[PDB]
Design a protein around this ligand. Structure first.
Ligand SMILES: *C(=O)N1C[C@H](NOS(=O)(=O)O)CC[C@H]1C(N)=O
Ligand SMILES: *C(=O)N1C[C@H](NOS(=O)(=O)O)CC[C@H]1C(N)=O
Ligand SMILES: [Cl-]
Ligand SMILES: [Cl-]
Ligand SMILES: [Cl-]
Ligand SMILES: [Cl-]
Ligand code: NA
Ligand code: NA
Ligand code: NA
Ligand code: NA
Ligand code: NA
Ligand code: NA
Ligand code: NA
Ligand code: NA
Ligand code: NA
Ligand code: NA
Ligand code: NA
Ligand code: NA
Ligand code: NA
Ligand code: NA
Ligand code: NA
Ligand code: NA
Ligand code: NA
Ligand code: NA
Ligand code: NA
Ligand code: NA
Ligand code: NA
Ligand code: NA
Ligand code: NA
Ligand code: NA
Ligand code: NA
Ligand code: NA
Ligand code: NA
Ligand code: NA
Ligand code: NA
Ligand code: NA
Ligand code: NA
Ligand code: NA
Ligand code: NA
Ligand code: NA
Lengths: 275, 275
Protein backbone atom coordinates (compact mmCIF):
# COMPACT_ATOMS: atom_id res chain seq x y z
CA UNK A 1 0.00 0.00 0.00
CA UNK A 2 2.70 2.46 1.06
CA UNK A 3 4.94 0.74 -1.46
CA UNK A 4 2.23 1.25 -4.08
CA UNK A 5 1.97 4.99 -3.33
CA UNK A 6 5.72 5.22 -3.64
CA UNK A 7 5.65 3.48 -7.04
CA UNK A 8 2.93 5.89 -8.20
CA UNK A 9 5.01 8.89 -7.22
CA UNK A 10 8.11 7.45 -8.90
CA UNK A 11 6.12 6.87 -12.09
CA UNK A 12 4.79 10.45 -12.03
CA UNK A 13 8.34 11.70 -11.73
CA UNK A 14 9.64 9.66 -14.69
CA UNK A 15 9.09 12.36 -17.32
CA UNK A 16 9.81 15.40 -15.17
CA UNK A 17 13.15 17.00 -15.92
CA UNK A 18 14.10 17.65 -12.31
CA UNK A 19 15.58 15.90 -9.30
CA UNK A 20 12.68 15.67 -6.86
CA UNK A 21 13.16 14.72 -3.21
CA UNK A 22 10.14 13.62 -1.22
CA UNK A 23 9.62 12.65 2.42
CA UNK A 24 6.48 12.00 4.43
CA UNK A 25 6.16 11.09 8.10
CA UNK A 26 2.95 10.51 10.02
CA UNK A 27 2.71 12.55 13.19
CA UNK A 28 0.59 10.21 15.27
CA UNK A 29 1.16 6.93 13.41
CA UNK A 30 4.11 5.09 11.82
CA UNK A 31 3.58 6.07 8.20
CA UNK A 32 6.83 6.79 6.39
CA UNK A 33 7.65 7.39 2.70
CA UNK A 34 10.92 8.57 1.12
CA UNK A 35 11.77 9.23 -2.54
CA UNK A 36 15.24 10.25 -3.76
CA UNK A 37 16.04 11.03 -0.14
CA UNK A 38 19.79 10.45 -0.06
CA UNK A 39 20.50 13.51 -2.22
CA UNK A 40 21.23 16.99 -0.89
CA UNK A 41 18.63 19.56 -1.85
CA UNK A 42 19.00 23.31 -1.63
CA UNK A 43 16.60 24.60 1.02
CA UNK A 44 16.27 28.28 -0.07
CA UNK A 45 13.60 29.93 2.07
CA UNK A 46 12.50 26.70 3.78
CA UNK A 47 15.35 27.21 6.23
CA UNK A 48 13.50 30.13 7.76
CA UNK A 49 11.54 27.45 9.65
CA UNK A 50 14.77 26.26 11.25
CA UNK A 51 15.76 29.88 11.92
CA UNK A 52 12.42 30.56 13.63
CA UNK A 53 12.90 27.52 15.89
CA UNK A 54 16.31 28.79 17.01
CA UNK A 55 15.04 32.34 17.49
CA UNK A 56 12.01 31.36 19.53
CA UNK A 57 14.14 29.02 21.65
CA UNK A 58 16.50 31.89 22.38
CA UNK A 59 13.60 34.13 23.34
CA UNK A 60 12.11 31.31 25.48
CA UNK A 61 15.38 30.49 27.28
CA UNK A 62 16.53 34.03 27.85
CA UNK A 63 13.06 35.12 29.00
CA UNK A 64 12.72 37.69 26.20
CA UNK A 65 9.16 38.51 25.27
CA UNK A 66 8.22 38.26 21.59
CA UNK A 67 6.65 41.69 21.88
CA UNK A 68 10.04 43.27 22.58
CA UNK A 69 11.40 45.26 19.64
CA UNK A 70 14.55 45.41 17.55
CA UNK A 71 15.70 48.64 15.97
CA UNK A 72 15.62 47.90 12.26
CA UNK A 73 18.05 50.19 10.45
CA UNK A 74 17.39 51.30 6.90
CA UNK A 75 20.48 49.29 5.91
CA UNK A 76 18.88 46.15 7.47
CA UNK A 77 16.13 46.57 4.82
CA UNK A 78 18.11 46.02 1.63
CA UNK A 79 16.35 46.78 -1.70
CA UNK A 80 17.40 43.95 -4.11
CA UNK A 81 15.68 41.14 -2.39
CA UNK A 82 12.16 39.93 -1.77
CA UNK A 83 10.91 41.94 1.21
CA UNK A 84 7.40 42.88 2.17
CA UNK A 85 8.89 44.56 5.28
CA UNK A 86 10.85 46.93 3.12
CA UNK A 87 7.83 47.94 1.06
CA UNK A 88 5.84 48.42 4.28
CA UNK A 89 8.61 50.53 5.90
CA UNK A 90 10.59 52.15 3.13
CA UNK A 91 12.49 54.51 5.44
CA UNK A 92 13.29 51.79 7.90
CA UNK A 93 14.92 53.12 11.06
CA UNK A 94 12.14 51.92 13.29
CA UNK A 95 11.38 49.60 16.20
CA UNK A 96 9.71 46.29 15.19
CA UNK A 97 8.75 43.44 17.50
CA UNK A 98 10.24 40.00 17.22
CA UNK A 99 6.62 38.88 16.62
CA UNK A 100 6.14 41.14 13.61
CA UNK A 101 9.55 40.28 12.17
CA UNK A 102 9.05 36.53 12.57
CA UNK A 103 5.54 36.65 11.03
CA UNK A 104 6.88 38.46 7.98
CA UNK A 105 9.94 36.19 7.72
CA UNK A 106 7.93 32.94 7.95
CA UNK A 107 4.42 33.66 6.56
CA UNK A 108 5.58 36.08 3.85
CA UNK A 109 9.16 34.79 3.46
CA UNK A 110 10.80 38.17 3.97
CA UNK A 111 14.53 37.97 3.21
CA UNK A 112 15.52 41.04 5.25
CA UNK A 113 13.61 39.73 8.28
CA UNK A 114 15.47 36.44 7.86
CA UNK A 115 18.87 38.10 8.00
CA UNK A 116 17.87 40.45 10.85
CA UNK A 117 16.95 37.33 12.81
CA UNK A 118 20.20 35.47 11.86
CA UNK A 119 22.04 38.45 13.31
CA UNK A 120 19.90 38.45 16.48
CA UNK A 121 20.33 34.72 17.12
CA UNK A 122 24.10 34.91 16.54
CA UNK A 123 24.62 33.71 12.96
CA UNK A 124 24.10 30.76 10.61
CA UNK A 125 26.46 28.56 12.68
CA UNK A 126 24.33 29.04 15.79
CA UNK A 127 21.27 27.87 13.91
CA UNK A 128 23.11 24.97 12.26
CA UNK A 129 24.28 23.75 15.66
CA UNK A 130 20.90 24.25 17.30
CA UNK A 131 19.27 22.05 14.72
CA UNK A 132 22.01 19.41 14.87
CA UNK A 133 21.58 19.24 18.65
CA UNK A 134 17.90 18.44 18.37
CA UNK A 135 19.16 15.08 17.02
CA UNK A 136 18.39 15.72 13.35
CA UNK A 137 21.31 14.94 11.05
CA UNK A 138 21.66 15.89 7.36
CA UNK A 139 20.84 19.57 7.54
CA UNK A 140 23.46 22.21 6.67
CA UNK A 141 22.93 25.90 7.47
CA UNK A 142 25.78 28.02 6.18
CA UNK A 143 24.64 31.16 4.38
CA UNK A 144 22.32 34.08 4.99
CA UNK A 145 19.96 35.39 2.34
CA UNK A 146 22.36 38.20 1.47
CA UNK A 147 25.13 35.66 1.08
CA UNK A 148 22.99 33.46 -1.20
CA UNK A 149 22.11 36.40 -3.46
CA UNK A 150 25.82 37.13 -4.10
CA UNK A 151 26.42 33.99 -6.14
CA UNK A 152 24.53 31.17 -7.74
CA UNK A 153 26.31 28.28 -5.99
CA UNK A 154 25.95 29.57 -2.42
CA UNK A 155 22.38 28.21 -2.13
CA UNK A 156 23.65 24.64 -2.37
CA UNK A 157 25.55 25.13 0.91
CA UNK A 158 22.20 25.42 2.65
CA UNK A 159 21.13 21.84 1.99
CA UNK A 160 19.00 19.10 3.44
CA UNK A 161 17.81 15.61 2.97
CA UNK A 162 14.01 15.45 2.73
CA UNK A 163 13.68 12.92 5.55
CA UNK A 164 15.67 15.23 7.84
CA UNK A 165 13.06 17.88 7.20
CA UNK A 166 10.07 15.76 8.14
CA UNK A 167 11.93 14.38 11.22
CA UNK A 168 12.36 17.96 12.32
CA UNK A 169 8.77 18.91 11.48
CA UNK A 170 7.52 16.00 13.59
CA UNK A 171 9.70 16.94 16.62
CA UNK A 172 8.26 20.41 16.26
CA UNK A 173 4.58 19.42 15.83
CA UNK A 174 4.69 17.25 18.90
CA UNK A 175 6.00 20.36 20.70
CA UNK A 176 9.28 18.72 21.63
CA UNK A 177 11.30 21.85 20.79
CA UNK A 178 9.66 25.05 22.13
CA UNK A 179 7.52 26.44 24.95
CA UNK A 180 3.78 26.04 24.47
CA UNK A 181 3.37 29.75 23.60
CA UNK A 182 6.23 29.77 21.11
CA UNK A 183 4.99 26.54 19.55
CA UNK A 184 1.48 27.95 19.25
CA UNK A 185 2.94 31.13 17.77
CA UNK A 186 5.12 29.42 15.19
CA UNK A 187 2.41 26.95 14.23
CA UNK A 188 -0.16 29.71 13.74
CA UNK A 189 2.44 31.64 11.73
CA UNK A 190 2.98 28.59 9.45
CA UNK A 191 -0.76 28.15 8.86
CA UNK A 192 -0.95 31.86 8.10
CA UNK A 193 1.66 31.44 5.36
CA UNK A 194 0.43 33.08 2.16
CA UNK A 195 3.20 31.93 -0.20
CA UNK A 196 3.02 28.87 -2.37
CA UNK A 197 -0.68 28.39 -2.44
CA UNK A 198 -0.42 26.13 -5.52
CA UNK A 199 2.27 23.92 -3.95
CA UNK A 200 1.43 21.54 -1.10
CA UNK A 201 -2.02 23.15 -0.76
CA UNK A 202 -2.68 23.30 -4.50
CA UNK A 203 -4.90 20.28 -5.10
CA UNK A 204 -6.12 19.61 -1.54
CA UNK A 205 -9.72 20.32 -0.58
CA UNK A 206 -10.57 23.94 0.16
CA UNK A 207 -9.94 24.71 3.82
CA UNK A 208 -7.43 21.94 4.49
CA UNK A 209 -5.07 23.11 7.26
CA UNK A 210 -1.48 23.29 5.93
CA UNK A 211 1.21 24.69 8.21
CA UNK A 212 4.05 25.28 5.81
CA UNK A 213 7.07 27.16 4.55
CA UNK A 214 8.00 27.49 0.88
CA UNK A 215 11.28 28.19 -0.94
CA UNK A 216 12.25 29.16 -4.46
CA UNK A 217 15.38 29.92 -6.43
CA UNK A 218 15.79 31.87 -9.59
CA UNK A 219 16.60 30.27 -12.95
CA UNK A 220 20.10 30.46 -14.37
CA UNK A 221 21.29 31.25 -17.90
CA UNK A 222 21.02 27.52 -18.75
CA UNK A 223 17.33 27.34 -17.93
CA UNK A 224 17.79 25.50 -14.61
CA UNK A 225 15.72 26.41 -11.56
CA UNK A 226 17.75 25.14 -8.59
CA UNK A 227 14.91 24.96 -6.05
CA UNK A 228 11.11 24.95 -5.89
CA UNK A 229 10.18 23.63 -2.47
CA UNK A 230 7.36 23.37 0.11
CA UNK A 231 7.53 21.77 3.58
CA UNK A 232 4.87 21.47 6.28
CA UNK A 233 2.38 19.62 8.40
CA UNK A 234 -1.07 18.85 7.04
CA UNK A 235 -4.27 18.09 8.94
CA UNK A 236 -6.37 15.24 7.67
CA UNK A 237 -10.17 15.21 7.77
CA UNK A 238 -10.01 13.15 10.97
CA UNK A 239 -7.69 15.48 12.84
CA UNK A 240 -4.57 13.39 12.42
CA UNK A 241 -1.48 14.95 10.78
CA UNK A 242 1.35 14.22 8.39
CA UNK A 243 4.62 16.03 7.79
CA UNK A 244 5.62 16.31 4.16
CA UNK A 245 8.59 17.87 2.38
CA UNK A 246 9.00 18.19 -1.37
CA UNK A 247 12.10 19.63 -3.06
CA UNK A 248 11.95 20.07 -6.85
CA UNK A 249 15.60 20.70 -7.65
CA UNK A 250 17.79 21.49 -10.65
CA UNK A 251 14.75 21.63 -12.82
CA UNK A 252 14.53 22.25 -16.53
CA UNK A 253 10.75 22.56 -16.18
CA UNK A 254 8.87 25.82 -16.08
CA UNK A 255 7.57 27.22 -12.80
CA UNK A 256 4.01 26.08 -13.32
CA UNK A 257 5.21 22.49 -13.73
CA UNK A 258 7.54 22.72 -10.74
CA UNK A 259 4.68 23.82 -8.51
CA UNK A 260 2.36 21.24 -9.97
CA UNK A 261 4.86 18.50 -9.11
CA UNK A 262 4.55 19.45 -5.46
CA UNK A 263 0.77 19.76 -5.62
CA UNK A 264 0.29 16.42 -7.37
CA UNK A 265 2.69 14.51 -5.10
CA UNK A 266 0.95 15.97 -2.07
CA UNK A 267 -2.50 15.09 -3.50
CA UNK A 268 -1.34 11.51 -4.07
CA UNK A 269 -0.23 11.26 -0.45
CA UNK A 270 -3.41 12.92 0.81
CA UNK A 271 -5.61 10.59 -1.27
CA UNK A 272 -3.77 7.54 0.17
CA UNK A 273 -3.97 8.67 3.77
CA UNK A 274 -7.68 9.68 3.67
CA UNK A 275 -8.54 6.30 2.12
CA UNK B 1 28.96 79.46 -10.52
CA UNK B 2 27.75 76.36 -12.36
CA UNK B 3 31.41 75.52 -12.88
CA UNK B 4 31.95 75.95 -9.14
CA UNK B 5 29.10 73.57 -8.28
CA UNK B 6 30.59 71.06 -10.69
CA UNK B 7 34.01 71.35 -9.02
CA UNK B 8 32.39 70.82 -5.62
CA UNK B 9 30.68 67.66 -6.79
CA UNK B 10 33.89 66.36 -8.38
CA UNK B 11 35.76 67.00 -5.12
CA UNK B 12 33.10 65.15 -3.12
CA UNK B 13 33.47 62.20 -5.45
CA UNK B 14 37.27 62.03 -5.13
CA UNK B 15 37.33 59.54 -2.24
CA UNK B 16 34.27 57.52 -3.18
CA UNK B 17 35.09 54.11 -4.58
CA UNK B 18 32.50 54.18 -7.34
CA UNK B 19 31.94 55.53 -10.83
CA UNK B 20 29.26 58.17 -10.38
CA UNK B 21 27.41 59.72 -13.32
CA UNK B 22 25.52 62.94 -12.77
CA UNK B 23 23.31 65.10 -15.00
CA UNK B 24 21.10 68.07 -14.23
CA UNK B 25 18.91 70.07 -16.60
CA UNK B 26 16.69 73.00 -15.70
CA UNK B 27 13.12 72.60 -16.91
CA UNK B 28 12.24 76.24 -17.44
CA UNK B 29 15.74 77.77 -17.68
CA UNK B 30 19.06 76.88 -19.34
CA UNK B 31 20.86 75.35 -16.38
CA UNK B 32 22.94 72.33 -17.32
CA UNK B 33 25.51 70.26 -15.39
CA UNK B 34 27.15 66.95 -16.36
CA UNK B 35 29.68 64.83 -14.45
CA UNK B 36 31.24 61.63 -15.83
CA UNK B 37 28.50 61.69 -18.45
CA UNK B 38 30.19 59.91 -21.35
CA UNK B 39 30.17 56.56 -19.55
CA UNK B 40 27.42 53.95 -19.82
CA UNK B 41 25.61 53.29 -16.58
CA UNK B 42 23.35 50.36 -15.83
CA UNK B 43 19.81 51.64 -15.40
CA UNK B 44 18.27 48.77 -13.34
CA UNK B 45 14.77 49.79 -12.28
CA UNK B 46 15.06 53.37 -13.57
CA UNK B 47 14.08 52.06 -16.99
CA UNK B 48 10.56 51.45 -15.74
CA UNK B 49 10.08 55.19 -16.37
CA UNK B 50 10.86 54.65 -20.04
CA UNK B 51 8.60 51.58 -20.05
CA UNK B 52 5.73 53.59 -18.55
CA UNK B 53 6.11 56.25 -21.25
CA UNK B 54 5.83 53.63 -23.99
CA UNK B 55 2.90 51.89 -22.30
CA UNK B 56 0.90 55.06 -21.73
CA UNK B 57 1.58 56.18 -25.31
CA UNK B 58 0.24 52.87 -26.56
CA UNK B 59 -2.87 53.23 -24.41
CA UNK B 60 -3.26 56.87 -25.58
CA UNK B 61 -2.84 56.09 -29.29
CA UNK B 62 -4.92 52.95 -29.39
CA UNK B 63 -7.68 54.57 -27.30
CA UNK B 64 -7.34 51.99 -24.50
CA UNK B 65 -8.50 53.22 -21.13
CA UNK B 66 -6.09 52.83 -18.21
CA UNK B 67 -8.92 51.30 -16.22
CA UNK B 68 -9.10 48.33 -18.59
CA UNK B 69 -7.68 45.13 -17.09
CA UNK B 70 -5.10 42.51 -17.96
CA UNK B 71 -5.47 38.94 -16.79
CA UNK B 72 -2.42 38.39 -14.61
CA UNK B 73 -1.59 34.69 -14.50
CA UNK B 74 0.03 33.17 -11.44
CA UNK B 75 3.09 32.52 -13.64
CA UNK B 76 3.24 36.28 -14.45
CA UNK B 77 3.86 36.78 -10.69
CA UNK B 78 7.19 35.03 -10.26
CA UNK B 79 8.45 34.48 -6.66
CA UNK B 80 12.25 35.22 -6.76
CA UNK B 81 12.05 38.86 -7.50
CA UNK B 82 11.01 42.04 -5.75
CA UNK B 83 7.23 42.21 -6.12
CA UNK B 84 4.68 43.90 -3.94
CA UNK B 85 2.02 42.72 -6.45
CA UNK B 86 2.88 39.13 -5.75
CA UNK B 87 2.62 39.54 -1.99
CA UNK B 88 -0.70 41.36 -2.46
CA UNK B 89 -2.08 38.65 -4.80
CA UNK B 90 -0.33 35.42 -3.96
CA UNK B 91 -2.67 33.24 -6.05
CA UNK B 92 -2.51 35.55 -9.00
CA UNK B 93 -4.93 34.57 -11.75
CA UNK B 94 -6.85 37.80 -11.55
CA UNK B 95 -7.82 40.87 -13.56
CA UNK B 96 -5.75 44.01 -12.76
CA UNK B 97 -6.06 47.40 -14.41
CA UNK B 98 -3.25 48.98 -16.35
CA UNK B 99 -3.52 51.78 -13.75
CA UNK B 100 -2.90 49.46 -10.80
CA UNK B 101 -0.09 47.63 -12.59
CA UNK B 102 1.67 50.84 -13.64
CA UNK B 103 1.38 52.36 -10.13
CA UNK B 104 2.97 49.28 -8.60
CA UNK B 105 5.66 49.07 -11.31
CA UNK B 106 6.67 52.74 -11.03
CA UNK B 107 5.92 53.87 -7.43
CA UNK B 108 6.84 50.54 -5.81
CA UNK B 109 9.23 49.25 -8.50
CA UNK B 110 7.47 45.92 -8.95
CA UNK B 111 9.52 43.62 -11.19
CA UNK B 112 6.62 41.38 -12.24
CA UNK B 113 4.53 44.42 -13.19
CA UNK B 114 7.47 45.63 -15.26
CA UNK B 115 7.66 42.42 -17.26
CA UNK B 116 3.85 42.15 -17.62
CA UNK B 117 3.98 45.62 -19.17
CA UNK B 118 6.98 44.77 -21.45
CA UNK B 119 4.85 41.92 -22.76
CA UNK B 120 1.80 44.16 -23.23
CA UNK B 121 3.73 46.87 -25.10
CA UNK B 122 5.44 44.31 -27.36
CA UNK B 123 8.89 43.79 -25.83
CA UNK B 124 12.12 45.56 -24.89
CA UNK B 125 12.85 46.43 -28.55
CA UNK B 126 9.55 48.30 -28.85
CA UNK B 127 10.44 50.40 -25.84
CA UNK B 128 14.02 50.96 -27.01
CA UNK B 129 12.77 52.22 -30.36
CA UNK B 130 10.04 54.36 -28.84
CA UNK B 131 12.57 56.17 -26.73
CA UNK B 132 15.07 56.54 -29.58
CA UNK B 133 12.32 58.09 -31.72
CA UNK B 134 11.62 60.79 -29.17
CA UNK B 135 15.04 62.12 -30.26
CA UNK B 136 16.99 60.96 -27.19
CA UNK B 137 20.18 59.10 -28.06
CA UNK B 138 22.37 57.05 -25.68
CA UNK B 139 19.75 54.86 -24.08
CA UNK B 140 19.77 51.08 -24.58
CA UNK B 141 16.81 48.90 -23.57
CA UNK B 142 17.54 45.23 -24.13
CA UNK B 143 16.52 43.02 -21.21
CA UNK B 144 13.48 42.42 -19.05
CA UNK B 145 13.71 42.04 -15.29
CA UNK B 146 13.55 38.25 -15.59
CA UNK B 147 16.38 38.37 -18.10
CA UNK B 148 18.51 40.58 -15.81
CA UNK B 149 18.04 38.23 -12.85
CA UNK B 150 19.44 35.28 -14.86
CA UNK B 151 22.99 36.62 -14.97
CA UNK B 152 25.10 39.35 -13.48
CA UNK B 153 26.23 40.97 -16.74
CA UNK B 154 22.80 41.33 -18.35
CA UNK B 155 22.07 44.55 -16.41
CA UNK B 156 24.84 46.37 -18.26
CA UNK B 157 22.92 45.89 -21.54
CA UNK B 158 20.25 48.20 -20.16
CA UNK B 159 22.46 51.29 -20.08
CA UNK B 160 22.26 55.04 -20.32
CA UNK B 161 24.22 58.20 -20.26
CA UNK B 162 23.06 60.50 -17.45
CA UNK B 163 22.44 63.44 -19.78
CA UNK B 164 20.18 61.26 -21.93
CA UNK B 165 18.09 60.64 -18.85
CA UNK B 166 17.56 64.28 -17.97
CA UNK B 167 16.88 65.15 -21.66
CA UNK B 168 14.14 62.57 -21.56
CA UNK B 169 12.83 63.74 -18.18
CA UNK B 170 12.59 67.31 -19.52
CA UNK B 171 10.69 66.24 -22.70
CA UNK B 172 8.34 64.41 -20.37
CA UNK B 173 7.86 67.20 -17.80
CA UNK B 174 7.01 69.69 -20.47
CA UNK B 175 4.36 67.16 -21.58
CA UNK B 176 5.91 66.72 -25.02
CA UNK B 177 5.40 62.93 -24.95
CA UNK B 178 1.92 61.94 -23.65
CA UNK B 179 -1.70 63.05 -23.48
CA UNK B 180 -2.53 65.42 -20.64
CA UNK B 181 -4.27 62.65 -18.66
CA UNK B 182 -1.44 60.16 -19.10
CA UNK B 183 1.13 62.82 -18.24
CA UNK B 184 -0.81 63.77 -15.12
CA UNK B 185 -1.11 60.09 -14.24
CA UNK B 186 2.57 59.26 -14.69
CA UNK B 187 3.70 62.41 -12.92
CA UNK B 188 1.45 61.74 -9.92
CA UNK B 189 2.71 58.14 -9.91
CA UNK B 190 6.35 59.38 -9.80
CA UNK B 191 5.63 61.75 -6.90
CA UNK B 192 3.89 58.87 -5.14
CA UNK B 193 7.07 56.79 -5.39
CA UNK B 194 7.91 55.32 -1.99
CA UNK B 195 11.31 53.79 -2.83
CA UNK B 196 14.60 55.51 -2.27
CA UNK B 197 13.55 58.04 0.25
CA UNK B 198 17.19 58.62 1.32
CA UNK B 199 18.39 59.14 -2.27
CA UNK B 200 17.47 62.29 -4.21
CA UNK B 201 14.98 63.25 -1.47
CA UNK B 202 17.30 62.38 1.41
CA UNK B 203 18.70 65.75 2.44
CA UNK B 204 16.11 68.08 0.85
CA UNK B 205 13.65 69.98 3.03
CA UNK B 206 10.65 68.03 4.28
CA UNK B 207 7.84 68.21 1.75
CA UNK B 208 9.94 68.99 -1.31
CA UNK B 209 8.15 67.56 -4.38
CA UNK B 210 10.33 64.89 -6.03
CA UNK B 211 8.89 62.95 -8.96
CA UNK B 212 11.30 60.08 -9.28
CA UNK B 213 12.22 56.50 -10.05
CA UNK B 214 14.97 54.56 -8.30
CA UNK B 215 17.08 51.54 -9.27
CA UNK B 216 19.37 49.16 -7.43
CA UNK B 217 21.48 46.12 -8.19
CA UNK B 218 22.73 43.46 -5.87
CA UNK B 219 26.38 43.13 -4.83
CA UNK B 220 28.58 40.47 -6.36
CA UNK B 221 31.07 38.08 -4.74
CA UNK B 222 33.79 40.76 -5.15
CA UNK B 223 31.93 43.34 -3.10
CA UNK B 224 30.84 45.45 -6.09
CA UNK B 225 27.36 46.95 -6.27
CA UNK B 226 26.75 47.60 -9.98
CA UNK B 227 23.99 50.20 -9.62
CA UNK B 228 22.47 52.51 -7.02
CA UNK B 229 20.47 55.11 -8.92
CA UNK B 230 17.73 57.77 -8.63
CA UNK B 231 16.28 59.93 -11.43
CA UNK B 232 13.54 62.56 -11.34
CA UNK B 233 12.20 66.07 -11.47
CA UNK B 234 12.34 68.28 -8.40
CA UNK B 235 10.24 71.33 -7.55
CA UNK B 236 12.06 74.31 -6.13
CA UNK B 237 10.59 76.62 -3.50
CA UNK B 238 9.59 79.03 -6.27
CA UNK B 239 7.75 76.50 -8.38
CA UNK B 240 10.46 76.06 -10.98
CA UNK B 241 11.85 72.57 -11.66
CA UNK B 242 15.04 70.69 -12.39
CA UNK B 243 15.61 67.22 -13.79
CA UNK B 244 18.40 65.29 -12.12
CA UNK B 245 19.85 61.82 -12.63
CA UNK B 246 22.48 60.18 -10.46
CA UNK B 247 23.99 56.75 -11.15
CA UNK B 248 26.37 55.35 -8.51
CA UNK B 249 27.92 52.46 -10.41
CA UNK B 250 30.41 49.65 -9.83
CA UNK B 251 30.74 50.68 -6.26
CA UNK B 252 32.92 49.20 -3.57
CA UNK B 253 31.08 51.33 -1.00
CA UNK B 254 28.36 50.06 1.28
CA UNK B 255 24.71 50.81 0.57
CA UNK B 256 24.42 53.62 3.07
CA UNK B 257 27.30 55.44 1.37
CA UNK B 258 25.91 54.80 -2.10
CA UNK B 259 22.59 56.37 -1.14
CA UNK B 260 24.31 59.22 0.64
CA UNK B 261 26.26 60.04 -2.52
CA UNK B 262 22.97 60.63 -4.32
CA UNK B 263 21.49 62.61 -1.43
CA UNK B 264 24.55 64.83 -1.01
CA UNK B 265 24.97 65.53 -4.74
CA UNK B 266 21.29 66.41 -4.97
CA UNK B 267 21.54 68.67 -1.88
CA UNK B 268 24.51 70.46 -3.45
CA UNK B 269 22.50 71.11 -6.61
CA UNK B 270 19.42 72.15 -4.62
CA UNK B 271 21.47 74.55 -2.46
CA UNK B 272 22.95 76.16 -5.62
CA UNK B 273 19.64 76.56 -7.40
CA UNK B 274 17.72 77.98 -4.39
CA UNK B 275 20.52 80.52 -3.84
C1 LIG C 1 12.94 31.94 -0.45
O1 LIG C 1 13.14 30.85 -0.97
N1 LIG C 1 12.94 33.04 -1.06
C2 LIG C 1 12.40 34.24 -0.46
C3 LIG C 1 11.17 34.67 -1.23
N2 LIG C 1 10.03 33.76 -0.98
O2 LIG C 1 9.77 32.87 -1.91
S1 LIG C 1 9.00 31.64 -1.44
O3 LIG C 1 7.64 31.94 -1.77
O4 LIG C 1 9.26 30.42 -2.12
O5 LIG C 1 9.58 31.37 0.06
C4 LIG C 1 11.58 34.87 -2.68
C5 LIG C 1 12.20 33.63 -3.28
C6 LIG C 1 13.34 33.08 -2.46
C7 LIG C 1 14.59 33.85 -2.74
N3 LIG C 1 14.96 33.87 -4.03
O6 LIG C 1 15.14 34.52 -1.89
C1 LIG D 1 15.12 47.92 -9.60
O1 LIG D 1 16.22 48.45 -9.75
N1 LIG D 1 14.90 46.91 -8.88
C2 LIG D 1 13.55 46.53 -8.50
C3 LIG D 1 13.39 46.70 -7.01
N2 LIG D 1 13.33 48.13 -6.64
O2 LIG D 1 14.42 48.66 -6.14
S1 LIG D 1 14.53 50.18 -6.27
O3 LIG D 1 14.08 50.66 -5.00
O4 LIG D 1 15.84 50.72 -6.39
O5 LIG D 1 13.84 50.50 -7.71
C4 LIG D 1 14.46 45.86 -6.32
C5 LIG D 1 15.85 46.24 -6.77
C6 LIG D 1 16.02 46.21 -8.27
C7 LIG D 1 16.23 44.81 -8.74
N3 LIG D 1 17.27 44.18 -8.18
O6 LIG D 1 15.43 44.25 -9.47
CL1 LIG E 1 14.85 37.72 -3.76
CL1 LIG F 1 8.09 22.60 19.40
CL1 LIG G 1 14.75 41.47 -7.09
CL1 LIG H 1 4.74 63.85 -21.57
NA1 NA I 1 13.06 13.07 -9.55
NA1 NA J 1 -0.62 10.43 11.67
NA1 NA K 1 18.48 10.61 3.67
NA1 NA L 1 13.37 50.60 4.01
NA1 NA M 1 6.15 45.77 15.76
NA1 NA N 1 6.46 48.56 15.92
NA1 NA O 1 3.49 39.48 8.04
NA1 NA P 1 27.06 31.58 14.46
NA1 NA Q 1 27.31 28.64 9.30
NA1 NA R 1 22.01 18.41 11.01
NA1 NA S 1 22.74 31.15 -4.31
NA1 NA T 1 18.47 12.26 6.75
NA1 NA U 1 -0.92 28.29 4.54
NA1 NA V 1 -0.14 29.25 1.43
NA1 NA W 1 1.98 28.71 -5.54
NA1 NA X 1 11.61 28.48 -8.00
NA1 NA Y 1 13.49 26.04 -15.11
NA1 NA Z 1 32.87 59.05 -9.76
NA1 NA a 1 14.22 75.69 -14.23
NA1 NA b 1 26.95 61.72 -22.72
NA1 NA c 1 1.00 35.19 -6.97
NA1 NA d 1 -7.18 46.69 -10.74
NA1 NA e 1 -8.84 44.48 -10.20
NA1 NA f 1 1.06 50.56 -5.92
NA1 NA g 1 10.00 44.38 -29.18
NA1 NA h 1 15.51 44.82 -27.00
NA1 NA i 1 18.40 56.09 -27.46
NA1 NA j 1 22.00 41.48 -14.38
NA1 NA k 1 23.77 61.46 -24.14
NA1 NA l 1 8.55 60.41 -4.01
NA1 NA m 1 10.49 58.28 -2.31
NA1 NA n 1 16.56 55.27 0.42
NA1 NA o 1 22.05 48.95 -4.95
NA1 NA p 1 29.27 47.45 -2.55
Amino acid sequence: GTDSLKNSIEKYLKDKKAKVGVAVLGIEDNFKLNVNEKHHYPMQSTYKFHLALAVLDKLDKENISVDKKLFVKKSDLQPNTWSPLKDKYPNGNLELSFSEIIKSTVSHSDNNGCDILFRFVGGTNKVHNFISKLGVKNISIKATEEEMHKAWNVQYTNWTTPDATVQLLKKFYKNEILSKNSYDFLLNTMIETTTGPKRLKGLLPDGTVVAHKTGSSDTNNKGITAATNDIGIITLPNGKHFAIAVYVSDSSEKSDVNEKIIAEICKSVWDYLVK
